[PDB]
C-alpha cells in the first residue's frame, strides 16, 4: 500500500561533468592487448549529466523531501550513485507506469534482488520504508510501498544483491548502464570505493556485464526508488533522515557513438577514445592508434550525427481502391487477366488484413517491411 508524499515543486535542473565514465564491455570475447573499435550506444565523453540529491533540504523552514523525479529513457541511461547508507534501492521502467501497460520492477533489499515484469499500478511517489530492528541493527527490514497492485506478471528473477551493504566518509560510486535493445534489458555495472570527490571522479572504470533480461517490453520513462529512514506521519525538525542529502545520484543518456576501446594483456578495457569529441580523437580513430606522430593527417567524418528526420510526401488524401481490386465479386480468367491502373491515392495495406488473409505474399525487388515508407510511380494490379 502506497503513501502520499508532498508535491515535488519542480526543482530547477543542475548539471555536472562525467569525465570519461559509462564505458561498458560490448562483447563477451576475451580480448588481450588489442584496440577494438565498436559502434554502439555509449555515454558521450565530458557530457552534462543531471544530478539529483536523494533528499533535498531547500525550504526556508527546513523541509526534507526525496527528489524522485520520473525521468525519460532515451535509447539507454547511465545511472551513477554516490551514497554511504543504502538509501537508493532500485528503479522502475515503463511507458505509462500504470496498469494499462507493462512495467519493470528492480528493487534491492538486504538479501537479494527482485526483478518483476507485471502491470503495476505505481503510485506517484514509490519508496521503501526502512526501519532497523530493536537489538541487532545489522540488517534493515524493508516495507514495500512501490505499487498499489500487480497483475499479468510474465517475468521473475532473483539473485545476489545489485547494491552491496553500505553499513564515515566512505562514499562509493556504483554505476550502471541500462539498455533495452531487441527485447532484452541489458544491465552493466561496476562498483568502486571513492574518496573526497563530491562529484563524479576523473578516471576510467569499465562496466562489466551483469544480466540480460528477456523482458520484451517497451520502456520510455524511468524513476528511482529511495529508502525512507525517517517517518512520513511525523517529520523530524532535522537529522531524522540521512544528513540532508549528502547522498546523490547521476543520470546520463546514451547516444550512438563510435568508441576505440583498448584491451590490455589481462583482457581489460584500460582506455577509450570518443571519435566525436575533439580532432585529436578523430585522428586517433582514423589511424586506429592512441598515439599519433608529428604531421598532417586526413581524417574521416565522425563528428556529426543526425538527430531529426523529415518526411516529405505529395498532397494525397484519398485511400486506394483496394476494395475494388481485392473484394470484387468476380475475377478475370488467367488467360485474359485483368490489369488495372492504381494512381492518385495512398497505398495502405494495413486495411487489407482486417478481414482478408493472404496465403501468399512475396515481394520481388522490394522488401515488404520497407513498403510503407515508399512512393511508387505507376502501379498495375
Amino acid at each position: 500500500q502506497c503513501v502520499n508524499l508532498t508535491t515535488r515543486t519542480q526543482l530547477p535542473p543542475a548539471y555536472t561533468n562525467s569525465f570519461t565514465r559509462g564505458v561498458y564491455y560490448p562483447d563477451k570475447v576475451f580480448r588481450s592487448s588489442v584496440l577494438h573499435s565498436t559502434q554502439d550506444l555509449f555515454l558521450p565523453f565530458f557530457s552534462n549529466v543531471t544530478w539529483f540529491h536523494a533528499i533535498h533540504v531547500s525550504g526556508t523552514n527546513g523541509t526534507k523531501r526525496f527528489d524522485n523525479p520520473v525521468l525519460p529513457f532515451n535509447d539507454g541511461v547511465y545511472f551513477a550513485s554516490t551514497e554511504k547508507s543504502n538509501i537508493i534501492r532500485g528503479w522502475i521502467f515503463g511507458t505509462t507506469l500504470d496498469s494499462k501497460t507493462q512495467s519493470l520492477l528492480i528493487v534491492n533489499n538486504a538479501t537479494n534482488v527482485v526483478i518483476k515484469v507485471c502491470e503495476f499500478q505505481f503510485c506517484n511517489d514509490p519508496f521503501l520504508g526502512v526501519y532497523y530492528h530493536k537489538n541487532n541493527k545489522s540488517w534493515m527490514e524493508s516495507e514495500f510501498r512501490v505499487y498499489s497492485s500487480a497483475n499479468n506478471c510474465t517475468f521473475e528473477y532473483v539473485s545476489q544483491p545489485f547494491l552491496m551493504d553500505l553499513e564515515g566518509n566512505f562514499k562509493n560510486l556504483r554505476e550502471f548502464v541500462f539498455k533495452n535493445i531487441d527485447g532484452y534489458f541489458k544491465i552493466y555495472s561496476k562498483h568502486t570505493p571513492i574518496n573526497l570527490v563530491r562529484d563524479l571522479p576523473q578516471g576510467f572504470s569499465a562496466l562489466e556485464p551483469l544480466v540480460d533480461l528477456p523482458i520484451g517490453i517497451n520502456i520510455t520513462r524511468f524513476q528511482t526508488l529511495l529508502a525512507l529512514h525517517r517517518s512520513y506521519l511525523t517529520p523530524g525538525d532535522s537529522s531524522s533522515g540521512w544528513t540532508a542529502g549528502a547522498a546523490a545520484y547521476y543520470v546520463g543518456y546514451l547516444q550512438p557513438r563510435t568508441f576505440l576501446l583498448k584491451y590490455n594483456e589481462n583482457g581489460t578495457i584500460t582506455d577509450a577514445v570518443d571519435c566525436a569529441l575533439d580532432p585529436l580523437s578523430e585522428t586517433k580513430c582514423t589511424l586506429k592508434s592512441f598515439t599519433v606522430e608529428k604531421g598532417i593527417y586526413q581524417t574521416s567524418n565522425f563528428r556529426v550525427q543526425p538527430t531529426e528526420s523529415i518526411v516529405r510526401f505529395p498532397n494525397i488524401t484519398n485511400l486506394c481502391p483496394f476494395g475494388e481490386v481485392f473484394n470484387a465479386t468476380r475475377f478475370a480468367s488467367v488467360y485474359a487477366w485483368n490489369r488495372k491502373r492504381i494512381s492518385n491515392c495512398v497505398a495502405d495495406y494495413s486495411v487489407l488484413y482486417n478481414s482478408a488473409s493472404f496465403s501468399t505474399f512475396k515481394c520481388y525487388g522490394v522488401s515488404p517491411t520497407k513498403l510503407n515508407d515508399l512512393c511508387f510511380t505507376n502501379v498495375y494490379a
Epitope: 508524499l5 517517518s231 531524522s240
Partner: antibody, heavy 122, light 109 residues
C-alpha cells in the same frame, strides 16, 4: 505544556453523526502527526485513526475503517474526527494524542488530551 | 494482528518493587512503550523504547526487555503509582502501520 484540549462529545442515538474537535497549543502543530485513541468504559485503550503532519495520509482501524473520517486544519491548529453511523460498541472516552517518533517503523504517544465521552443511547 | 498479553492485576505492598511484564512474539523484534493512566486522568508516557524515561517522570520508574518479554519495574511503590499501566507496540504487518495496546494492570498499593 504542549496541551491538547478537545471538546464536542455527548450522548447520541445510534445512526447519527457526531464531530469531535481537538484543539492544540504550545507546540508546532503542523510539524507533528496526530492520532485518536478510544478507551471503552471498563476496557483498555484502542487506537482508531491516524492523520499525517500535512494531513496527506490517514489510516483507520479495521473495525472502524471507512465509517469515520479524520481531518486536520493546520491554520486553526485543531484536530477533527468526523464520525458517521455510530453503533453501540462506539461508546468510549476518545483521546486525541500526538505521534512522538521520527523513525519509520515505530511510534508512540507522548502527549494526550483530557478526553471526550461519546455515549450511544439505545 | 498479534495481541499483547498483559496480566489483569498486581498487588504490591508499599516500599517494594513492582515488575509489570507483557510479552508477545513481535515484542522480541519491536520496541514497546509504557503509559500510566491514573483513575480520572489521561494516560501519560512513562517508559518508551523499552528503557528510556522522559523528563517529568520520577526516577523510580525503570524499564528493560528480556527477549520476548518486556518489563516495567518501579524502584519503590509509592501510593501515587496506583494506576493503570499499558503496553504498546507497532505492528507493520498489514498494508498500513497499526498500533496494538495491552489489557492493562490494576496496581494496588
Amino acid at each position: 505544556q504542549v496541551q491538547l484540549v478537545e471538546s464536542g462529545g455527548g450522548v447520541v442515538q445510534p445512526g447519527r453523526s457526531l464531530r469531535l474537535s481537538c484543539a492544540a497549543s504550545g507546540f508546532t502543530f503542523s510539524s507533528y502527526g496526530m492520532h485518536w485513541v478510544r478507551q471503552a468504559p471498563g476496557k483498555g485503550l484502542e487506537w482508531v485513526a491516524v492523520i499525517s503532519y500535512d494531513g496527506s495520509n490517514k489510516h483507520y482501524a479495521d473495525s472502524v475503517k471507512g465509517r469515520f473520517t479524520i481531518s486536520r486544519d493546520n491554520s486553526k491548529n485543531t484536530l477533527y474526527l468526523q464520525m458517521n453511523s455510530l453503533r453501540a460498541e462506539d461508546t468510549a472516552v476518545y483521546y486525541c494524542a500526538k505521534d512522538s517518533g521520527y523513525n519509520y517503523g515505530y511510534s508512540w504517544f507522548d502527549p494526550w488530551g483530557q478526553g471526550t465521552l461519546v455515549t450511544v443511547s439505545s | 494482528s498479534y495481541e499483547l498479553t498483559q496480566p489483569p492485576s498486581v498487588s504490591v505492598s508499599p516500599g517494594q518493587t513492582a515488575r509489570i511484564t507483557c510479552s508477545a512474539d513481535a515484542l522480541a523484534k519491536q520496541y514497546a512503550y509504557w503509559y500510566q493512566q491514573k483513575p480520572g486522568q489521561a494516560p501519560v508516557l512513562v517508559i518508551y523504547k523499552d528503557s528510556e524515561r522522559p523528563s517529568g517522570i520520577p526516577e523510580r520508574f525503570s524499564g528493560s526487555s528480556s527477549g520476548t518479554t518486556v518489563t516495567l519495574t518501579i524502584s519503590g511503590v509509592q501510593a501515587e503509582d496506583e494506576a493503570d499501566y499499558y503496553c504498546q507496540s507497532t505492528d507493520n504487518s498489514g498494508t498500513y502501520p497499526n498500533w496494538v495496546f495491552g489489557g492493562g494492570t490494576k496496581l494496588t498499593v
